[PDB]
Structure formats: structure tokens, C-alpha cells
């Protein structure tokens, strides 16, 4: 999209990247004014204010100020001072745009006469830039497309001295022949390397002392900023010179940015009641025509659209906007809200109805008493959920809400806001059943959709060859055809998916803004691709005309960016066009009809289709050809196609505002190459009832929609009265064709019937399936990750550590803090007891084996059982079971020695009584402190005192205090009942504390083997005695 | 019943090529157990149907035998088989 920039961005930018050897003056010498900045700072930042003579003129997008007298010349400073004054934040007025003042721009005078007066412009066009040089530039320019020298650079050529010198420099002085000649060759290198698309200097003065812009007013390519961001800086583009931006306009401008969705909102009178919010730019461009046509032109306030499908929170976003800026009035004759559009194609319907539903639910109090009924005619993939989802609210709210499907006309519902009526070489075929596609990207949804067309279509084969996802290796995706399964193969190179498929003919690329152009480049190296489908929005013009020169040298049709793709019935379909099946269905899209469309739009591609299926025998193909300034392809090579195929009958085009493209129609149908009945539409008549210059853009003044409605009409074309004419200018025409007999409608055959998904189906609850699988310890789905039940920023802001999160996530308990505290205590003590234990002995050798960290880790634990890393489970049972048995310390002592079993957790090596463990102290100490009561703990101690009676070193173990003072937390904090604490006890959450501690100690290990480089390890011999038997 | 009836589609989440064990016989990579028994392979021979998918010729399925033979033990020195007496030796 091109955008303007301000006089002071243009020239600034052109003399920080202009290269030339001439000699340019001035260069970042400007000045910038606004009513709200002192002059003191500006006095002191540029000394060439004094220096010599200076000019002020204002920098807002104005044109013509000289014929309008807006400019001061030849006047010193205090001058543009005392000017200013009159003028700086006073009311202006320019043809039909009103406006204030708040920017000025001042730079040295430049003496000069009109013998020096150049002018210089570089323009964009599909077949590459023009030159326009004028000699007699300036005020007296007159006529400048037919006087000035023009000159053409091609797509991907060079504007060489030369060419200059003989076709642009005529009529030059001799003396400034040359050096202008190099200037003007450096400038075209700023043109096209700063992404330009509209660069005009006017007057451009150049003397012997050097040359000198005066004025420059261009226009650059908004969506190279991801090519040119370093050089643009922080490029601003104005605003129309006019009325000042709303903050919700600003606001939508901010969301646009946001995702890649297209979301626009203009105003002309905020106090009027007829509002807009429509889906998709053809639909909202298409209900402007249609109200402002039926008597709604100065009571419309809004014209605005999104598409590229929102998100839920986006029509949130654009919904409140639109509601808190309808409540600002109150209107009593009333006010209306027209919602919905056309039939999405992959714009989900569902969300964004629930999102205004949302968003309107908290907005029933400011705008219930401004008299508010909203009229929704809404289709697309979900709509039959979303719409009555709505209805269902506005019920409930109790608004005015009447929804309509796709059964209605798309423009009935305005009729009925307005109470007019009563509310109730390149190839001609490019696709055919046997047309095989490869697809770039990872769209799985798209691809099943073709797949899934292909199948009602009756078609022997599946349209969609490969695959091509380079980042990825080569494999097979599941993808079903009918009921079956199938695999298509996915590559990471385009190569040897060409290779392996030598049957495939198109190309849908699915590659963003910024890899389209390059994925393009590389598939027109394969002269089996004929036809490529680009989806993406936003690639720069520059890029599409290179790709646009190549196809044309190559014999490749493009269906150019920024496009849903196209459909033929019976044989193919591009990506998400028509839809979901249900729609494909429901226009009968898996059958060919007779009538071939072209538009630029999506979205009234998808209206077409619906309306063509109600109207007459069917769609034979359809096409929308994108909304990009540069469509790959054409109205007019479409419609070319569609006179040489003997399928399609009538051909219907839907044009829009600017661009003399329907005019190759009219030049078609005037003379004899198009002999079949064309229905043709252009949509965008209101754009002259706006008084703004509203991005897509009319540029002269037969380019606008009446103009061309009226030229085909002379032309010989059947033009509807209007757009809600369309439907019935076209079922006469089918049915005068019928009538005459050339064409006989077929047989309605029912295809072939596709299995509901099983997603779709659990959604809409029609099955049952039973859950295999249960948990109750963390819910990963969802906006926040959650540890029983309890959020986890939450169980930050709690400031538990581990021994809360393991609270939490063992026994879905909020813990104490003593007993979280004890936890990580009982962690601390258990991380590692040295590399001669049989854990950490096995975890070495696996280590040492130059394993894995998770292989050594993993063959430690293994070891972790009865005999190792056990004796904390064991001493919990052994000592609940005693103390629940109710028996005293010496009767439990006794029944174990006399069972032949010591006490578990009972004993230590070398430390007794008198030279305690010194890791049981700690423990015990914190223990007896913050514990409420520890009757185990007691119970354990009587039972070690005797057992030191007997010998000094039968101590309470760590792995003794550690299982009684656990099983004292669980039945003495107040988390647990005592079956909860005796089950965690049986399933062993004591064996979950000794092996999360110990596998600190075991990554410990294997990382301070893998430090030390210590190689394999291989048990010496003489450790091991060998007895084997003598002979078996 | 919905799966019965055809009237959902659900994708299957795995996929598998060398055993069938719903039907009446167990069958090893489209071979019947009878069959794999009558046709006297031994663990060579399984061993080629689960891992390769192939009936494999008898020396093949024999070498792959003498294979698995040879590699059985190799004392109790080496880190594999000592990790393992450790973890037996730990009653586990
Ligand atoms: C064109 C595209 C597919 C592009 O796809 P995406 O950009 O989303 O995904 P990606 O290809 O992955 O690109 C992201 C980049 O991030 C990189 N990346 C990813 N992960 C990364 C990581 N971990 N680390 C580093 N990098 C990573 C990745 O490598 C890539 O890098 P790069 O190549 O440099 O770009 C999509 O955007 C688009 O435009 N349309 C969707 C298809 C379609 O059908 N359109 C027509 C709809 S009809 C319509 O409009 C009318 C209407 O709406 C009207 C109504 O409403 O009624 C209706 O419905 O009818
Ligand atoms: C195969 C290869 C390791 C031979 O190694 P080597 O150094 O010749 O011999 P070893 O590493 O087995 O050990 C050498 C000595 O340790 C002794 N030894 C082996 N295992 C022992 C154990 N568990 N306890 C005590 N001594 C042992 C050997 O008897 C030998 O004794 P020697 O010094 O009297 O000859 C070496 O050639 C090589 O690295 N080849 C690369 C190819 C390969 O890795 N093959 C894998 C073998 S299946
Ligand atoms: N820096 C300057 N030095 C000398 N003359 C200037 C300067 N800037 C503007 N002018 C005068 O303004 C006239 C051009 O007006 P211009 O600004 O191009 O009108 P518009 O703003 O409508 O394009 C020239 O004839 C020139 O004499």
C-alpha cells in the first residue's frame, strides 16, 4: 500500500541516502514548526536561520499552495514569523478538505528564476517506473503527462546516463546537461532502493553552485517497512489533510498492526445513525453503495471492515470501539447497527459472533436507551453456531436483533434497516479433475478441505501431491480422503517434490509476505508449474512486478497475492476458498454449473458463489484475483480464459473503484473478441460521497464505479441498477440462455457424502466417548498452568517454594509453611550421600559409559528399593504400625527381636548417643520447633532410648526420623484426615522423597564425571571370583 | 456406535507394521503364527518378520541367531553387566 509521507520525512531521507557525484546543497538543512514548541531552542539548533533569506511553508500533505497563496517566499525570519501568525493553527480550507494548521517547515531561500525551473517525478506502474522530466517545470508545468519527457525503466532494469542524456534531455541547457543527468540517476537509485513508489521534485533548481529540492512530494511502499526498517527509521505516514483523527480511528489503525488482519474504520459524521460493521473490505465497500444508493448518503457515519480473520479479542477490540463511539449521540428518530457481510471462506464466523456477543453483552446499559437495532446477515465457517449464539444473547438482553443466513440477500437486511422493505504461453485451462498441486507450507486444515472437495467432487485422485515444509524433514502426513487414509508426502526442498511428482501443475503457496516472493522465484524454475496460487497479503508491489515479469517470460499464470484463491466445481479448488464442506454443499460447488466469475475479493467471491448457485445452473469457475495493485493475473486474462473455454456460458466480473481495467472489457465487447453475455458490477460508487481520499484508490476521474458501470453498460455488457440487482440480472440472463437453449442444465446428481469430524461432532455434544485416562494434579490447558487447582503465578505470589509445589502437586494440599519448609529440609538432607552407595555407584558407571544424563540418572534410580534408599518407607510402616497397634516402645522393641527383624531406622556406623548424626539433630530440632504435636516422634525417641541402652550407636537414623516426622506432618498438620495420611503413606510418598532428593546427588555425580573425563569403567578381575561349574 | 455407523471421522494417532494381534490368529508382519511355526523359523526368523518385515532366507535367520549367541555374556566385568549384579544385588 502506498502511503505519503511528509515533505520534511521525503527530504530528509533523501539526502541522508541519495548518492551522486553532484554536488547537492542543503542537505538536512530544515527546519520544523509547530504551535506547541517554543522558538528559542529553535533559534539556537540552526544558525542558518539568520544567515541568509529564508521560506516557510506548511508540511501537512498540501498541494497547490502556490496557486492557493500558502506559501511566503523572499521574506526574512521575523517575516515567517508575522506569517505564521495568521495561519499557524487557523482554520484552512484546500477544494473540499477543511483543516487546521500544526506543521510548518523552513528552509534557506534559494535565488532563482523560471530558466531553472526542473521539474523531475518517478511514478510506479505495473510495467515498471516512469520519468517525467519537464525543462519548463514548476507553476507553468501545465500539461505534464503529454509535455514533459517521459521515459519507462522496466521490471528489473537500469536507468543508464545515456538514456538520460538523449530521451530525457532534449530540451535541457547544455551546461546542465550532464550533472542533472547523474543526479538524476543517483535519484532514481534512492527510488527504488527506499521502496518508492511515487517521488516527484517540483521545483528542482540547479545552478552552478549545485542543485537544490525545493519541494518533493512522494509516496512510499508501506509494506516494505520489513525490508527498509533500518533505512526508514521510524517512518510516519500523515493523514489526509482534513479532519483530525479520532482516538478510536487511531485506536483500529493500532490494531491493524497487531496480527494479520485487516482492520479498518473511517469516519465522515460521527452524528449520524446509520453504522456499519462489516466483514471483509468488499462486503463493507458493497453495503456503503448499497445504503448511500436507497437514501442513506449524509446519515451514514462509519465505513470500516475486518477480515483476514480476527480473532475473538480483535472484534472484542473493534466492537467496543465501534459502540463506545455510537453511544457519543443521542438520535431520537433512532439508530442502526448493520453487521456481518458476506460468506467467510477461512474467516472463523464462531469466534468473531462470540466476540461482539462479549462485547456487547457489557454495552447493553450506554446504548439500550439510544434506541439501538442491529440487523446481522453473517455466513461463513461456523456460522450457524455463531449466528444463533447471538440470537440467543440479544434474546436474552432483549436489543432489537434479527439474524438472517445466508438465504437471504446479503443487502435485504439494509432494506430492512431503512424500512424500504418489510422485515421478515499461458494456458486456458488451468485446472481440471486430474490437476495435481503441491503446497507450500504447513496447512494441514486447507489441504483436508481440498481433499475433502476433491472427494464430493466424485474426483478419481486427491488434488494435492505434496507438501513442501523446509523446516522439516522429508516425511508422510495423514490426511483422509472420504473415510479412508491416506499419506501425502511432505519435503523440506521444492526440488525433490518436483522430482518424485512429475504430474503436478500448480503451485498454492502458502509462504508469508516476506518468503513468498523468494518460494516463487524458486518454483517458476520448474517449467511442470503452470499455474501458482499466491495467499499472502502485504508483499511489496516491487516484489509482485518482478515475480509478474517472470511468469510473463515463463508462460506461468499467477493468481496474484492477497487472494482466498479460486474454485472450479467438479475439478479443484484453491486452499480455503468456498469454505468449509457444508458450504461447498450448500452452493453445490462440487458440480459444474455454467457461469465463470472474476472479482478482486474473497469474500464476494464466496457471495458469488452463493448467489450463482441460487440463481442459475452453477458456478463453472471462479477466480478472485487479490487485492494487491499488481494482481498476477488480471479481470481481463480471466476473462480471456473464459471466452476460449466452451464450458462457461455467461461470464459475471465484480470491478471495484480505480483502475481502467474493465475498460479492456468494454474494448473487448465492443469489438467481437468477447461474444459471451458478461454481467459486470464494479462496486465503490459511494466513493464520491466521501470527502476524503479513503485507501483500493481512485486515481483519475474515469477510473471511479459509475464511470465504468456506464461504460459497460454502452459497451454492451448487462450492468445491474446495482449490486442487489446482481442477483436478478443474472438469473435473467441464465434464464434467457436456457430459454434460447444453449445451455441445458444437468441432472442434479447428489454427491458423494463425507464422515463428520469427530471434533466437530464432540463440540456440538453428539457423541459420547469415555475419557481413558485421570488426573487431578495440574491443568496445562487453559490461560494459566495450574497445580491443584491453585494458579501458578498464585503459588509465586504465595511464596511456597518446592515444598509447596510438592504439596501441592503429591497430595493436592496447601501445606503449611513449616511443613513446606520441613519438605525441602528433608530434601536438603537426602541430595547425597557420597559415590559408594549403589545408586550413585551405578549412575558413575553409566556416566563413565559416556551415556546421558538421563540414561546415568535413570540407572541410578533403579537401584533405589528394598535394600538401598528404602529404610525411609520401611521406619514410617514399622513405627505407624507400632504406635497404632497401641503396644509401648519395649513391648515394640521386644516383638521385633523376637521376630527376627531390626528396627528400621534404627543404627548408624560410627555416631551414637553422645556424638549425634548431626542431620537428624537439625531435623529434629526444626521438628520439635514448628511442629504442633509429634506423637511418632516421640513414640520413635522412648524406642531409641532403649535400643542406646543396649549398645551407644543404635541411634535414630536419618531415614528413622525422616519417615516418623513425616508421618507425624501428614496426621498432625491439618491438611490430611488420618485414612488420606495413612494412604500416602502405603503408596509411597516417602519413596518419592528419598528419590527426588537423591537425584540431585545423582545429576551431581554424572556431572562431575563427565567434568573429570573419566573414560569407561571395567571392574578388575581380581574382584570378582568366577565359580563356574566344571562342565555343563 | 458413530464409528460403526461411519458416520464420524476420527484419525488414528498411531500407526503400526509388524504385528496384528486383533483377529482370530496372531500374525508377525502379515504372517501367521501357524505359519511361522510350520515354516520353522526360529528367533532368526521372528526376529526378521518384527524388525524387518522380510521372510528372510534360513542362513540369514540362522546368522542372525549365532549373532545373538555370540553376544550373549561377556563376564561380569564389563559396565552393563556390573550395573545390573549391583541393582540384583540391591534386592531389586
Ligand atoms: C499467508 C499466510 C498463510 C502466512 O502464514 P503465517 O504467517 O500465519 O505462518 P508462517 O508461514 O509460519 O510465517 C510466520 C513466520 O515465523 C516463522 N517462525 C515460526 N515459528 C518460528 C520459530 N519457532 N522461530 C523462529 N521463527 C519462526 C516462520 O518461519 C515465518 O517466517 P517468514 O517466512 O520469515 O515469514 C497467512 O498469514 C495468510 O495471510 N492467510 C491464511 C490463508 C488464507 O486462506 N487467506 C485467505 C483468507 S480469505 C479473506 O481474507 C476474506 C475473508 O476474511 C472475508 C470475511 O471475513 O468474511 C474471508 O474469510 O472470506
Ligand atoms: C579392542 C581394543 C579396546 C583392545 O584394547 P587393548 O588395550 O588391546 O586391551 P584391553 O583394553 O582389553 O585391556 C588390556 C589389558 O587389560 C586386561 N583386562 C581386560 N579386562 C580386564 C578386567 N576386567 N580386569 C582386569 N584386567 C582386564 C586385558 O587382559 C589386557 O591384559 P594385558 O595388559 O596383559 O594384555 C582396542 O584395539 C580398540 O580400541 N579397538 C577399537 C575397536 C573397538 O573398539 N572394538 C570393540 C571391541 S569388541
Ligand atoms: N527554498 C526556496 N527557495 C526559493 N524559492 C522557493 C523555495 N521554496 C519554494 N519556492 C518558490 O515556490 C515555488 C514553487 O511552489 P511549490 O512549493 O512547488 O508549490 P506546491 O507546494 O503547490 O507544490 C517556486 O516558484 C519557488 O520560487
Redesign the interface.
Known amino acids: 500500500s502506498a502511503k505519503a509521507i511528509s515533505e520534511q520525512t521525503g527530504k530528509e531521507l533523501l539526502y541522508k541516502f541519495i548518492c551522486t557525484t553532484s554536488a547537492i546543497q542543503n542537505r538536512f538543512k530544515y527546519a520544523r514548526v509547530t504551535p506547541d514548541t517554543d522558538w528559542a531552542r529553535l533559534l539556537q539548533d540552526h544558525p542558518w536561520l539568520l544567515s541568509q533569506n529564508l521560506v516557510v511553508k506548511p508540511d501537512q500533505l498540501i498541494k497547490r499552495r502556490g496557486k492557493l497563496g500558502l506559501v511566503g517566499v523572499n521574506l526574512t525570519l521575523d517575516g515567517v514569523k508575522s506569517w505564521l501568525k495568521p495561519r499557524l493553527g487557523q482554520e484552512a480550507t484546500v477544494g473540499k478538505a477543511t483543516g487546521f494548521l500544526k506543521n510548518f517547515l523552513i528552509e534557506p531561500f534559494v535565488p532563482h528564476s523560471q530558466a531553472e525551473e526542473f521539474y523531475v517525478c518517478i511514478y510506479a506502474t505495473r510495467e515498471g517506473d516512469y520519468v517525467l522530466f519537464h525543462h519548463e517545470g514548476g507553476v507553468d508545468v501545465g500539461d505534464v503527462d503529454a509535455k514533459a519527457q517521459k521515459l519507462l525503466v522496466g521490471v528489473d532494469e537500469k536507468l543508464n546516463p545515456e538514456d538520460i542524456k538523449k530521451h530525457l534531455l532534449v530540451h535541457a541547457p547544455e551546461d546542465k546537461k550532464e550533472i542533472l543527468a547523474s543526479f538524476i540517476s543517483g535519484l532514481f537509485n534512492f527510488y527504488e532502493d527506499l521502496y518508492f513508489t511515487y517521488l516527484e521534485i517540483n521545483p528542482l533548481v540547479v545552478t552552478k553552485d549545485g542543485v537544490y529540492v525545493l519541494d518533493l512530494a512522494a509516496k512510499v511502499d508501506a509494506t516494505a517497512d520489513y525490508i527498509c526498517k533500518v533505512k526508514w527509521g521510524d517512518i510516519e505516514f500523515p493523514p489526509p489533510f482534513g479532519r483530525e483523527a479520532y482516538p478510536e480511528e487511531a485506536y483500529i489503525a493500532d490494531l491493524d498492526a497487531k496480527s494479520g488482519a485487516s482492520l479498518k474504520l473511517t469516519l465522515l459524521n460521527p452524528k449520524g445513525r446509520i453504522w456499519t460493521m462489516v466483514a471483509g473490505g468488499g462486503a463493507s465497500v458493497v453495503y456503503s453503495d448499497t445504503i448511500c444508493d436507497l437514501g442513506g448518503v449524509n446519515e451514514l457515519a462509519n465505513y470500516g471492515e475486518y477480515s483476514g480473520a480476527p480473532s475473538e479479542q480483535q472484534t472484542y477490540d473493534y466492537a467496543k470501539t465501534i459502540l463506545s463511539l455510537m453511544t457519543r449521540e443521542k438520535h431520537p428518530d433512532g439508530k442502526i447497527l448493520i453487521i456481518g457481510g458476506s460468506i467467510a471462506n477461512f474467516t472463523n464466523v464462531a469466534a468473531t459472533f462470540k466476540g461482539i456477543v462479549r462485547a456487547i453483552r457489557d454495552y447493553q446499559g450506554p446504548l439500550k436507551e439510544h434506541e439501538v437495532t442491529i440487523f446481522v446477515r453473517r455466513g461463513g465457517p461456523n456460522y450457524q453456531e455463531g449466528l444463533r449464539v447471538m440470537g440467543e444473547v440479544g434474546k436474552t438482553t432483549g436489543i432489537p436483533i434479527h439474524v438472517f443466513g445466508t438465504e437471504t440477500h446479503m443487502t435485504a437486511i439494509v432494506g430492512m434497516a431503512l424500512g424500504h422493505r418489510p422485515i421478515p504461453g499461458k494456458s486456458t485451462t488451468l485446472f481440471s479433475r486430474h490437476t495435481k498441486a503441491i503446497v507450500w507450507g504447513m496447512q494441514t486444515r486447507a489441504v483436508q478441505g481440498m481433499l475433502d472437495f476433491d472427494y464430493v467432487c466424485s474426483r478419481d485422485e486427491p488434488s494435492v501431491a505434496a507438501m513442501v515444509y523446509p523446516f522439516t524433514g522429508d516425511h508422510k502426513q495423514?490426511f483422509?480422503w472420504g473415510?479412508k487414509?491416506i499419506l501425502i508426502p511432505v519435503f523440506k526442498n521444492m526440488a525433490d517434490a518436483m522430482r518424485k511428482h512429475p504430474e503436478v501443475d500448480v503451485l498454492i503457496n502458502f509462504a508469508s509476505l516476506r518468503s513468498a516472493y523468494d518460494s516463487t522465484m524458486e518454483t517458476m524454475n520448474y517449467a511442470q508449474i503452470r499455474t501458482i496460487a499466491i495467499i499472502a497479503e502485504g508483499i511489496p508491489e516491487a516484489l509482485t512486478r518482478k515475480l509478474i515479469k517472470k511468469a510473463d517470460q515463463k508462460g506461468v499464470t499467477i493468481i496474484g497475492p492477497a487472494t482466498v484463491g479460486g474454485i472450479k466445481p467438479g475439478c479443484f479448488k484453491i486452499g480455503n476458498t468456498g469454505g468449509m464442506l457444508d458450504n461447498i454443499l450448500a452452493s453445490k460447488l462440487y458440480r459444474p454449473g455454467s457461469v465463470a466469475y472474476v472479482s478482486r475479493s474473497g469474500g464476494m467471491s464466496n457471495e458469488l458463489n452463493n448467489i450463482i448457485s441460487r440463481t442459475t445452473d452453477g458456478v463453472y469457475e471462479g477466480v478472485a484475483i487479490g487485492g494487491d495493485r499488481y494482481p498476477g493475473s488480471t479481470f481481463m486474462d480471466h476473462v480471456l480464459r473464459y471466452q476460449d473455454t466452451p464450458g462457461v456460458k455467461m461470464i459475471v466480473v465484480l470491478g471495484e473503484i480505480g483502475g481502467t481495467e474493465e475498460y479492456k472489457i468494454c474494448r473487448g465487447i465492443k469489438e467481437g473478441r468477447l461474444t459471451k453475455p458478461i454481467v459486470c458490477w464494479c462496486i465503490g460508487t459511494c466513493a464520491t460521497m466521501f470527502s476524503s481520499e479513503v485507501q483500493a484508490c481512485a486515481n483519475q476521474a474515469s477510473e471511479t464505479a459509475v464511470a465504468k458501470n456506464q461504460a459497460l453498460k454502452e459497451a454492451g455488457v448487462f450492468v445491474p441498477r446495482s449490486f442487489d440487482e446482481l442477483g436478478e440480472i443474472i438469473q435473467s440472463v441464465y434464464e434467457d440462455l436456457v430459454a434460447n437453449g444453449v445451455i441445458v442444465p444437468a441432472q442434479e446428481v447428489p454427491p458423494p457424502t463425507?464422515?463428520?469430524?469427530?471434533s466437530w461432532?464432540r463440540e456440538l455434544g453428539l457423541?459420547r466417548k469415555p475419557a481413558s485416562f485421570m488426573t487431578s494434579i495440574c491443568d496445562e490447558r487453559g490461560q494459566e498452568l495450574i497445580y491443584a487447582g491453585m494458579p501458578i503465578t498464585e503459588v509465586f505470589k504465595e511464596e511456597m517454594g518446592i515444598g509447596g509445589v510438592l504439596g501441592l502437586l503429591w497430595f493436592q494440599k496447601r501445606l503449611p509453611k513449616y511443613s513446606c519448609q520441613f519438605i525441602e529440609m528433608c530434601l536438603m538432607v537426602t541430595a547425597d550421600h557420597g559415590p559408594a552407595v549403589?545408586g550413585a555407584?551405578?549412575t558413575i558407571?553409566?556416566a563413565?559409559?559416556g551415556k546421558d544424563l538421563v540414561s546415568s540418572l535413570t540407572?541410578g534410580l533403579?537401584?533405589i528399593?528394598?535394600?538401598?534408599g528404602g529404610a525411609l518407607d520401611a521406619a514410617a510402616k514399622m513405627f505407624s504400625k507400632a504406635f497404632d497397634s497401641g503396644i509401648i516402645p519395649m513391648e515394640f522393641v521386644n516383638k521385633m527381636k523376637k521376630e527376627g527383624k531390626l528396627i528400621m531406622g534404627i543404627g548408624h556406623r560410627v555416631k551414637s548417643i553422645n556424638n549425634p548424626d548431626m542431620r537428624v539433630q537439625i531435623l529434629k530440632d526444626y521438628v520439635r520447633q514448628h511442629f504442633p504435636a509429634t506423637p511418632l516422634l516421640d513414640y520413635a525417641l522412648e524406642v531409641e532410648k532403649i535400643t542406646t541402652s543396649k549398645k551407644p550407636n543404635l541411634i535414630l537414623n536419618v531415614a528413622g526420623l525422616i519417615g516418623v516426622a513425616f508421618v507425624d506432618m501428614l496426621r498432625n498438620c491439618g491438611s490430611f484426615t488420618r485414612e488420606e495420611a495413612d494412604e500416602y503413606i502405603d503408596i509411597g510418598a516417602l519413596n518419592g522423597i528419598f528419590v527426588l532428593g537423591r537425584s540431585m546427588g545423582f545429576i551431581g555425580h554424572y556431572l562431575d564425571q563427565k567434568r573429570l573425563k573419566q573414560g569407561?569403567?571395567?571392574?578388575?578381575?581380581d574382584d570378582?571370583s568366577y565359580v563356574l561349574p566344571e562342565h555343563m
Open positions: 495423514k483422509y473415510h487414509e463425507v464422515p463428520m469430524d469427530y461432532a457423541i549403589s555407584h551405578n558407571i553409566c563413565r559409559a540407572s533403579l537401584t528399593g528394598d535394600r538401598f569407561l569403567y571395567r571392574h578388575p578381575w570378582i
